[PDB]
Amino acid sequence: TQFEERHLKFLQQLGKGNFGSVEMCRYDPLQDNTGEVVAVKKLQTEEHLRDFEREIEILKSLQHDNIVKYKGVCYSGRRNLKLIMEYLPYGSLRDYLQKHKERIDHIKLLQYTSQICKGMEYLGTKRYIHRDLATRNILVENENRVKIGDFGLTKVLPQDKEYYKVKEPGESPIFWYAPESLTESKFSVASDVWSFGVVLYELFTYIEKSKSPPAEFMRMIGGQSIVTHLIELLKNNGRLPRPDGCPDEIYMIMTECWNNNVNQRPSFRDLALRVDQIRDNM
Amino acid sequence: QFEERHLKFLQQLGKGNFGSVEMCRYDPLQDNTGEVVAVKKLQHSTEEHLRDFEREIEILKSLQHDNIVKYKGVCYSRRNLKLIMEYLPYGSLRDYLQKHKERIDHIKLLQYTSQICKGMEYLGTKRYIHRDLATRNILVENENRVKIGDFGLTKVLPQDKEYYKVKESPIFWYAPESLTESKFSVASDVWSFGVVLYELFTYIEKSKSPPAEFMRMIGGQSIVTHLIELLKNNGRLPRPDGCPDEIYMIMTECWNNNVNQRPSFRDLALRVDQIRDNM
Ligand SMILES: Cc1cc(Nc2ncc(C)c(N3CC(CC#N)(N4CCN(C)CC4)C3)n2)sn1
Ligand SMILES: Cc1cc(Nc2ncc(C)c(N3CC(CC#N)(N4CCN(C)CC4)C3)n2)sn1
């Protein structure tokens, strides 16, 4: 489906990053305010533009209940290139949980967790490494469905290798990053699983700022970079604490996702089953 | 009977305005082999406080139950009157939960909640109003048992009334009618138990404490005046993060403005047992 810029009407800024922005837009070829509300991603260089084109190919290739729906592209055009997606009105799982936590029980968190795993399992089947797995990059469609909503750092594994080594000088979500992603820049399914452990931690802490990954890691750390301190803390088996009231089996899952050894981390297929089972037992 | 000369001070456990509890060895062989006990005494021994303490001692002596700290005896030496109790080594549920939260699940909280209800149900049968139900006044015997550990404010209901009118107070634990009229009842005990439940499911987090939350809702008049207005306007403590639906619902029913619409301790015990069984 083709989108003409002249019919793309700006409603509201949803989120701004270092290198991106997402906007709420109405696509209104009848210019009568009846056009479909959509989400529009665009840049704020030629490197970032090569990467964005890759990001667009990646999401176009994905069709799944738990991945934000690709709708199309909108060109003036490369400087003005926009990626058009469905608009999910409840926004990020991060803001939704912050807003609505007093109505979200353990059962509901486990439903969301399971859908994250299935979205991530499907990414696995394409050999795509997300590298940014966090509740801020998960959208709420409704009370009963979440989707992975951003692929801004996602990479394709080389054909004959199980990891992608990234050489980028930009800021990184280090408190979500596996030891081997920090030390060697190696991203894999296993570094995705590490990141998922912290998503689990995010959900069961109900994203309270006092218990956030940055807050907890900085408390354990106490003349070297924060990155050096984090690496040394993780090497020494420093880990995020058990969230208050987190069930035994969900903490055990967190702890296994945060194995120093890449090869000893659970699969997304195994994680989905264990989470479904913990949920069934409640 | 306990002789002061054999009561050997080990450590201060806690202090209030008018009394103190100490860890002591009772050692009549003075060889360091005597049994460790808990010893309560008055900070100021006025005649009135001493009459009250004698009442407090009779109250605990009358209580024989798995979920009430064991009375062991008294120390005369009358000005220097001491109450001797068992020493529970894990201390208050408040300090235990603060320390050990990372090893305590919802199932364990519900076990403790159930045992508090049974201790409170039994107080019921004697017509005793506790008036100080809080995790700081619950002791941990071991991983699998808690007890009500203090009866410093407890009253006996008059013969012909279902309430006692008592003319600093733990106001953030106090039922509206305790704040406005000083009326204590089993229903004000239930109100207070709601806040104990709230304490447990917030894992004694300072950021989520009753004082912290109530003062956040409030913001030239007393905190007590603002609290009464907030409670009359149906202001209430929020649902603790991940508190199960049925445990929040129980909290909310304990905090009914109407005394007569609060659950019984017998009903609370059954509902909490059942929520625990269903998990
Ligand atoms: C109020 C509200 C609703 C939102 N709905 C929405 N519907 C679709 C997408 C694609 C989307 N977004 C925000 C997103 C995060 C995710 N997933 N961006 C990524 C880029 N970041 C720089 C900012 C956040 C993609 N939001 S958002 N809020
Ligand atoms: C670490 C530890 C061990 C303790 N064990 C204990 N064993 C018996 C009693 C009676 C007791 N205590 C302290 C208590 C708290 C309650 N319930 N008092 C209530 C009166 N408050 C003014 C001060 C604290 C009764 N503690 S205590 N700590």
Q: Which amino acid type is present at position B26? A: Y
Q: How many residues does the structure list for chain A? A: 282
CA B230 – CA B214 distance, rounded (Å): 9
Please give the backbone phi and psi of residue B124, each rounded to the nearest 5 degrees, phi first: -45, -50
Phi first, then psi: give them for residue A130, nearest 5 degrees. -65, -55
Q: Which residues of A are catalytic?
A: 132
Is the CB–ligand 2 distance for residue B137 below 6 Å?
yes
Is any atom of ligand 2 closer than 6 Å to the C-beta of B75? Answer: no
For an interface test with A, the pick among B241, B243, B276, B278 (most A C-beta atoms closer than 10 Å) comes out as B241
Instruction: Tell whether domain B4-86 is in CATH 3.30.200.20.
Output: yes
- B57, B63, B65, B71 alpha-carbon torsion, rounded to 10°: 20
Q: Which residue has the tokens 């729906």?
A: A69
Beta-carbon contacts of B122 under 8 Å, excluding residues fewer than 6 positions away, are B63, B65, B67, B68
Q: Provide the CA A193 distance to its chain's centre, in angstroms.
A: 12
For residue A245, the chain B residues in CB contact (below 8 A) are 105-106, 109, 201, 203, 240-243
B142 beta partners: B145
Let me know: does A131 contact A152? Beta carbons within 8 Å.
Answer: no
**C-alpha pair distances (Å), B257 with each of A259, B157, B194, B233, B240:** 51, 21, 13, 10, 21
CATH class (in words) of the domain with range A5-86: alpha beta
Contact partners, residue A71, CB within 8 Å, separation at least 6: A1, A3, A38, A84, A85, A86
Distance between CA atoms of residues A53 and A44, nearest Å: 15
For residue A133, how many C-alpha atoms fall within 13 Å in the half-sphere facing its CB?
33
Output the CA torsion sign for B91, B92, B95, B101. positive
**Which of B24, B25, B92 to mutate for ligand 2's pocket (most ligand atoms within 8 Å of CB)?**
B92
Fold of B93-278: Transferase(Phosphotransferase); domain 1 (1.10.510)
This structure was determined by X-ray
In CATH, the architecture of A93-281 is: Orthogonal Bundle (1.10)
**Ligand lying nearest the CA atom of residue A96:** 1
Output the residue whose Cα is nearest ligand 2's atom 2: B91
Of A282, A103, A210, A93, which Cα lies nearest the Cα of B243?
A103
Domain locations along chain B: 4-86, 93-278
Would you call A242 and B205 a contact, using CB atoms and an 8 Å cutoff?
no
Which backbone phi and psi does A258 adopt, to 5 degrees?
-100, 30
Catalytically annotated residue among B132, B189, B245, B267: B132
Q: State the distance from the centre of ligand 1 to the C-alpha of A15, rounded, in angstroms.
A: 6
The CA–CA distances, whole Å, from B101 to A40, A108, A139, B104, B203 equal 44, 23, 31, 5, 6
Q: What are phi and psi of A152, to 5 degrees?
A: -70, -20
CA distance A183 to chain B (A): 29
- On the CB side of B76, how many CA atoms lie within 13 Å of its CA? 4
The alpha carbon dihedral of A182, A47, A44, A188 has a sign of negative
Pocket test for ligand 2, best of B150, B153, B173 (most atoms within 8 A of CB): B150
CB-ligand 2 contact for B176 (6 Å cutoff): no
**CA–CA dist A173, B158 (Å, integer):** 65
- Confirm or reject: Cβ of B91 under 6 Å from ligand 2: yes
In SS3 terms, chain B reads as: CCCHHHEEEEEEEEECCCEEEEEEEECCCCCCCCCEEEEEEECCCCHHHHHHHHHHHHHHHHCCCCCECCEEEEECCCCCCEEEEECCCCCEHHHHHHHHHHHCCHHHHHHHHHHHHHHHHHHHHHCEECCCCCHHHEEEEECCEEEECCCCCCEECCCCCCCEECCCCCHHHCCHHHHHHCEECHHHHHHHHHHHHHHHHCCCCHHHCHHHHHHHHHCCCCHHHHHHHHHHCCCCCCCCCCCCHHHHHHHHHHCCCCHHHCCCHHHHHHHHHHHHHHC
**Resolution attained, angstroms:** 2.2
From the CA of B16, the nearest ligand is 2
Contacts 24+ apart (CB under 8 A), B219-223: B223/B171
d(CA A94, CA A136): 5
Cα B70 to Cα B58: distance, rounded to the nearest angstrom: 13
Pocket-forming residues, ligand 1, beta carbon under 6 Å: A 14-17, 20, 22, 39, 68, 85, 87-89, 91-92, 137, 139, 149-150
For ligand 1, atom 24, name the residue with the nearest CA. A15
Nearest CA to ligand 1 atom 22: A17
- Could you tell me the two tokens for A167? 């050489």
